[PDB]
RNA sequence: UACCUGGUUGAUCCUGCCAGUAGCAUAUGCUUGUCUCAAAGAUUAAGCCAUGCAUGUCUAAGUACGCACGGCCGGUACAGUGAAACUGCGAAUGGCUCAUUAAAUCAGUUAUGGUUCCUUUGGUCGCUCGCUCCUCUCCUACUUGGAUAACUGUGGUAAUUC
RNA sequence: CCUAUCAACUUUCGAUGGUAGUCGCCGUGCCUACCAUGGUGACCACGGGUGACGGGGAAUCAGGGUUCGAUUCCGGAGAGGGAGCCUGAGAAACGGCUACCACAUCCAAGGAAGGCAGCAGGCGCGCAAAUUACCCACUCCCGACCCGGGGAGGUAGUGACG
């Protein structure tokens, strides 16, 4: 409600292809309407649908009244895709890391140092104990 | 990191006179302990040693002017010291009460909403107050010249207007509840 | 107690071995260990003793020259297929090549040859 | 122990003209081995994504490298800890925009926007003026740029303009009185000024005093002096902050006066 | 090392020794054997040192010191 | 089958007997402990703490209100099952070898061994409970024939005492007074168990000389011989089918720095009348000591040389599924 | 535990859960022995 | 914040130490609501150690004949992708602790014209200057020689990253 | 740093120097021949002691001073103790090796494998000090590399040092 983002320190960034930018948002009492919402209601002010915007950061301020957080606007989706930090992703989900996870890789790693030769074996050597 | 106290305690613990007069700046400017008036005592102490060291340095040496003025301009932008005095030898001059005046509370009492030294750090607190558009929970504080002129209710106490929370709403329910009966 | 050659005896003593040598394998650079090999001239306590026929006589033994066990890797040096069929290197190798089908590697077979070098 | 060198190095033990911040990080980038030494080396990364602030993650720092965008040098690099120097330029293809580090008199390095036509060149001090093997004579610039077959009448503690195109030597500046120095490291970093007098002492360390564009009078190891062209003409732009040297009073006044002015 | 003890009273139990053996270093643990069915405190016990130069000074010192109105004796176990 | 693991003893087991009233597992070691747990929902009933050396061998009675344990500590104790607490001891001067209950609960059989103060002789103590204590206590003993006995259990109707000897004899015995009746010679090794059927007329049999067999009560003929490779530490014959149940023995074992994963000792299922395999099921770490079935034959339960014991839940398609050739004729 | 498995637990599953699966597949004909060295 | 005050006696003035007193750094007692910052197995055994884990690594691009997977695309060597293995590099760095050592370590200031240095960065990349051209015959240049892994098969060992 | 209840010391197994050579990444009594008889001390040497790592730094003091420094950073040193060595530009390396010594482990008795003053944890010790957790996303390091691996390091938990 009775938002407005303001654009603080904004780049054009031609080399990353994107638009980098602060996003500060007042509000009347209550700090902070959602993440997907501000990345519908930039959407519309650069053009270029909420699915391409990432945004990020976020800390209510005391009181009320004014929330500062940060967004990016990728002009392309593969440009978004192509400088990529996984947390950013995580963020809201689309795509999210290894879950594998840890000592899994561990244990498999040291498997393969007992022998010479023959993968599947220490995969099969790693598997057997769930302990 | 690093850390460090923000407070002196003195070489002699029961000097009675001096506990009396301790408990006297306590009732006139409303603290809590005398670890309050302790916490101004180091700032006083340490404003003092820096002047006199200025003081006793060569004139017009670099250093001297340089940290005189900023010594100066920040003892003026908190409304302590006042610049048509505006030098080292009126600095020493300055005692504990010149500090609390100052203070946020003294402020709130002085115009607004407090009746009293008491009321007045209850009222900032329990965040009845914004200092601009920023509420500030800390009643000693020490605020600015020209700070002293947003001093005014918050949007968070329903009071002087703002959201309702759950005590304005209580008393509400004291006319329908406690005289609704239900 | 692996034998190798050069231990002797018909004891068995502790060498450290050094890569390039059979009873170690390689588990770090610059790393020997010292262990255990046993005599290169037999005494009657080993639990198997490798052999290699060498010449054949007239008659057979089942598992051994009856039945027949071959191998699907060619050479993939130029210069020994080359030789084989006395076909100049002027002209390369040319088709004679060693090349095995695979079946149903994929949803088809295929037919591999090695990649040449030299 | 001590087997060998550290790859390593830890924040809060870094050169602070670097400008990085305290112990809110653990690690420094730390240089690269290159044509320059470590202390007086800004990392690329930290010209790239602290001062033009164009990541915000590591991550992307490696991928912005491997995009090869950026030529250090008229060269094409993808080092992500680049160990540029003095008077190195730093050009970004993608934006047409060369940058030259060069220090602030306040001792930071400078963001000193260069036009294409002054980033064709530097001008690189010898170090070294070697007869070489074979009686081929050789340069040797401080940023240890070997050029063989050198202009045969130049001495010791002359510019050269290298040229960043075509490589080797583009004419030369001689070494004489008056010409423009910029002292760096020490107690008069990033001080522009002329020579004045050259004084010479037999045996190690000689001293050469200079006298700054204010008029203010110092000496400075030879060692310290770096000669960046002809006296009295200048062949690139003055860095912010002056360039020269400022009191601590008048930068206060600049400071409070820019400030809350712009917008 | 392991060091034996022998003339243990039965009002003599491992927090008795305990505090008796540490001017000779600090033990590691002090075992004794009881049997409740007869008596408390059997006769023996073994003590255990960390370190070698600990359980030898024990050994020498202990062997002609009373405790309890009795000479205890200490040897190498 | 489904089996699952219980835990609660350190050491080898040494004897499993289930109740008559079948919902509970008793299994003792050579720990100071005996654990007793629920057989129809594997839930630990509570331990038996008090014994001061290994209990080779405990039993429950008919009631459910009495266990009795025979110790290697020259003792024979009765333990109040419903409290957990020992309600009666005897000293004997000899341990217990083998301890069996009769059919009707009354009389209980210990075999001393011939080495301690008491000889050769399977002792009969009278389960007499006046008051709220059962006591035990001894009014007659069997004279052994020939060499020593191992084991001993009882023949047909509780009146015959079949036993088995260390030199491998089986022998019968007119249980009122002693002594043979008639005798075998058909092993060649220690007999270390011999338990009877339900329909009380033949025994099975196991021996460390490899074979278990089924043999006749009254003849004293082999019916049935079971071979298997590996010996036999025990024997029984499982009800609510016609099968036997055996369990042993030694097996290869190579590594005791893992001993969750060489599971590698089976109970194996061979049919009474054809004398085929039906199964192996694996599960034990080491030899099977003992095999124990639940007198429903709902459940059989195996205890291993690791030093646990498995409860193995049946389902309906393992009572309806026969080998072919068996169904068939 | 200093004794039995009735102290300090009560006896019960909180003496009866394991972290390792011990419930293992047998076929209910004759080939429970094949699935295992399968 | 540049301070002292209490105790020798009948009383008094001195010499004097003792006790009080504040700082602080660990320990310990007792108590303890919310907000932020974080030092923490040094002392004493640089004692002893179960188990888990802390260094690994592939680009269109050194080297694919996987039992691979997938193709129509097949011959000159032919595949797209790729477990593995060889090759090259890291493994000396990292982290930890302060036992050892008294001009030794180390700090600051100097040196290597007394020497070694992978890598990176910049130069240095046809030739025997024709053996007074074997290199026009030394005529393998449209390119030489032959063996190990992974692999396949047989195996040994109570137990080994054998 | 303390010590004279340590006043003479250094070479017969070089102590100092000359000369020449062996040797070493390279200087050099480094080592050796021959030849000299030196070198050092009351300005404390020599010897002995040391919970003696060094610095940047820390605490209190009117000023002067006094006390502290294993401990977030820099240098050096060691990884159970000794000795030797391989790889590599760099290691006399314990998540390399080899021997012995002190410790510990498996064994079928023939053998075989090992080093938490790494991170957690346990035992011992004491007046005294935390999770057998989660993650490579940050910060950086390594590699053939954006891509992988990291008890480096981040993150929470424990936490009235303060």
Not at chain 1, 2 to 30: A, C, E, S, Y
Not at chain 4, 172 to 177: N, P
Not at chain 5, 45 to 58: G, L, P, V
Request: glycine residues 8%; positive net charge; charged residues 30%.
């Amino acid at each position: 409600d009775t938002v407005t983002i303001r654009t603080r320190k904004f780049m054009t960034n031609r080399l990353l292809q994107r638009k980098q930018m602060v996003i500060d948002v007042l509000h009347p009492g209550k700090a902070t309407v959602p993440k997907t919402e501000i990345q519908e209601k930039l959407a519309k002010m650069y053009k270029t649908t909420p699915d391409v915007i990432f945004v990020f950061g976020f800390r209510t301020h005391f009181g009320g009244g004014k929330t500062t957080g940060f967004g990016m606007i990728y002009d392309s989706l593969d440009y978004a895709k192509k400088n990529e930090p996984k947390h950013r992703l995580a963020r809201h989900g689309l795509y999210e890391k290894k879950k594998t996870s840890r000592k899994q890789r561990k244990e498999r790693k040291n498997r393969m140092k007992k022998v010479r030769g023959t993968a599947k074996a220490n995969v099969g050597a790693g598997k057997k104990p769930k302990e | 990191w690093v850390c460090r106290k923000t407070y002196v305690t003195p070489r002699r613990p029961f000097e009675k006179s001096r506990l009396d007069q301790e408990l006297k700046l306590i009732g006139e400017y409303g603290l809590r302990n005398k670890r309050e008036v302790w916490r101004v005592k180091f700032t006083l102490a340490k404003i003092r040693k820096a002047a006199r060291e200025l003081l006793t340095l060569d004139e017009k040496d670099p250093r001297r002017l340089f940290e005189g003025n900023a010594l100066l301009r920040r003892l003026v932008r908190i409304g302590v010291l006042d610049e048509g005095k505006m030098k080292l030898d009126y600095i020493l001059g300055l005692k504990i009460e010149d500090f609390l005046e100052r203070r946020l509370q003294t402020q709130v009492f002085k115009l607004g909403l407090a009746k009293s030294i008491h009321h007045a750090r209850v009222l900032i607190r329990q965040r009845h107050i914004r200092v601009r558009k920023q509420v500030v929970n800390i009643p000693s504080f020490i605020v600015r010249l020209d700070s002293q002129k947003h001093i005014d209710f918050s949007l968070r106490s329903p009071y002087g207007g703002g959201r309702p929370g759950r005590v304005k709403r209580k008393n509400a329910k004291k006319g329908q509840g406690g005289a609704g009966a239900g | 107690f692996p034998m190798k050659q050069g231990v002797l005896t018909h004891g068995r003593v502790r060498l450290l071995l050094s890569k390039g040598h059979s009873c170690y394998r390689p588990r770090r650079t610059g790393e020997r260990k010292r262990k255990s090999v046993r005599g290169c001239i037999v005494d009657a306590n080993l639990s198997v003793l490798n052999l290699v026929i060498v010449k054949k006589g007239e008659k057979d033994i089942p598992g051994l020259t009856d039945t027949t066990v071959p191998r699907r890797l060619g050479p993939k040096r130029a210069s020994r297929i080359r030789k084989l069929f006395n076909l100049s290197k002027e002209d390369d190798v040319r088709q004679y090549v060693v090349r095995k089908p695979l079946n149903k590697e994929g949803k088809k077979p295929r037919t591999k040859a090695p990649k040449i070098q030299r | 122990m001590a087997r060998g060198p550290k790859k390593h190095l830890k924040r809060v033990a870094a050169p602070k003209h670097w400008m990085l911040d305290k112990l809110t990080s653990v690690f420094a980038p730390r240089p690269s081995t290159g044509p320059h030494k470590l202390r007086e080396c800004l990392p690329l990364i930290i010209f790239l994504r602290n001062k033009l602030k164009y990541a915000l993650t590591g991550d992307e720092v490696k991928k912005i490298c491997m995009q090869r965008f950026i030529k250090i040098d008229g060269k094409v690099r993808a080092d992500i800890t680049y160990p540029a120097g003095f008077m190195d330029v730093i050009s970004i293809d993608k934006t047409g925009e060369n940058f030259r580090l060069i220090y602030d008199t306040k001792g930071r390095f400078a963001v000193h926007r260069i036009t294409p036509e002054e980033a064709k060149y530097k001008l690189c001090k010898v170090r070294k003026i070697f007869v070489g093997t074979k009686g081929i004579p050789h340069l040797v610039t401080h940023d240890a740029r070997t050029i063989r077959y050198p202009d045969p009448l130049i001495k010791m503690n002359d510019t050269i303009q290298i040229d960043l195109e075509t490589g080797k030597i583009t004419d030369f500046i001689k070494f004489d009185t008056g010409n423009l120095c910029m002292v760096t490291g020490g107690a008069n970093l990033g001080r522009i000024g002329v020579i004045t007098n050259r004084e010479r002492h037999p045996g190690s360390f000689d001293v050469v005093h200079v006298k700054d564009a204010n008029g203010n009078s110092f000496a400075t190891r030879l060692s310290n002096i770096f000669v960046i062209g002809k006296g009295n003409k200048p062949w690139i732009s003055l860095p912010r902050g002056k360039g020269i040297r400022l009191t601590i009073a008048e930068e206060r006044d600049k400071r409070l006066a820019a400030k809350q002015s712009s917008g | 090392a392991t060091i034996r003890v022998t003339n243990l009273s039965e009002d003599t139990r491992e927090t008795d020794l305990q505090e008796l053996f540490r001017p000779f270093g600090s033990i590691s643990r002090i075992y004794l054997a009881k049997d409740k069915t007869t008596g408390q405190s059997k006769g023996f016990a073994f003590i255990s040192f960390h370190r070698r130069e600990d359980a030898a000074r024990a050994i020498a010192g202990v062997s002609g010191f009373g405790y309890d109105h009795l000479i205890l004796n200490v040897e190498w176990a | 089958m489904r089996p699952i693991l219980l835990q609660g003893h350190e050491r080898s087991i040494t004897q499993i007997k289930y109740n008559r009233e079948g919902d509970l597992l008793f299994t003792v070691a050579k720990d100071p402990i005996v654990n007793v747990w629920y057989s129809v929902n594997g839930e630990r009933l509570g331990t038996y703490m008090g014994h001061t050396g290994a209990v080779w061998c405990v039993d429950a009675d008919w009631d459910t209100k009495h266990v009795l344990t025979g110790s290697a500590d020259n003792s024979c104790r009765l333990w109040d099952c419903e409290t957990g607490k020992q309600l009666a001891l005897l000293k004997t001067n000899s341990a217990v070898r083998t301890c069996g209950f009769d059919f009707g609960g009354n009389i209980i059989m210990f075999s001393t061994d011939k080495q301690m103060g008491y000889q050769c002789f399977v002792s009969f103590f009278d389960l007499r409970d006046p008051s709220q204590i059962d006591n035990n206590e001894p009014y007659m003993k069997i004279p052994c024939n020939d060499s020593k006995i191992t084991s001993a259990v009882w023949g047909p109707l509780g009146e015959c005492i079949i036993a088995g000897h260390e030199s491998g004899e089986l022998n019968q015995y007119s249980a009122k007074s002693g002594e043979v009746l008639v005798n075998v010679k058909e092993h060649s090794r220690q007999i270390n168990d011999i338990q009877l059927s339900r329909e009380m007329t033949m025994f099975v049999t196991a021996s460390k000389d490899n074979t278990a067999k089924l043999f006749d009560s009254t003849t004293l003929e082999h019916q049935k011989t079971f071979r298997t490779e590996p010996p036999r530490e025990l024997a029984a014959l499982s009800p609510n089918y016609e099968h036997v149940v055996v369990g042993g023995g030694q097996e290869a074992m190579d590594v005791t720095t893992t001993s969750t994963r060489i599971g590698k000792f089976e109970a194996r299922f061979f049919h009474l009348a054809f004398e085929e395999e039906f199964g192996r099921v694996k599960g034990h770490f080491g030899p099977i000591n003992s095999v124990a079935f639940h007198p429903d034959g709902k459940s059989y339960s195996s205890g291993g040389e690791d030093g646990y014991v498995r409860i193995h839940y049946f389902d309906p398609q393992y009572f309806e599924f026969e080998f072919e050739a068996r169904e068939a004729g | 535990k200093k004794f039995g498995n009735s102290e300090f637990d009560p006896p019960g599953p909180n003496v009866a859960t394991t972290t390792v699966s011990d419930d293992v597949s047998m076929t209910f004909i004759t080939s429970k022995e094949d699935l295992n060295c399968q």
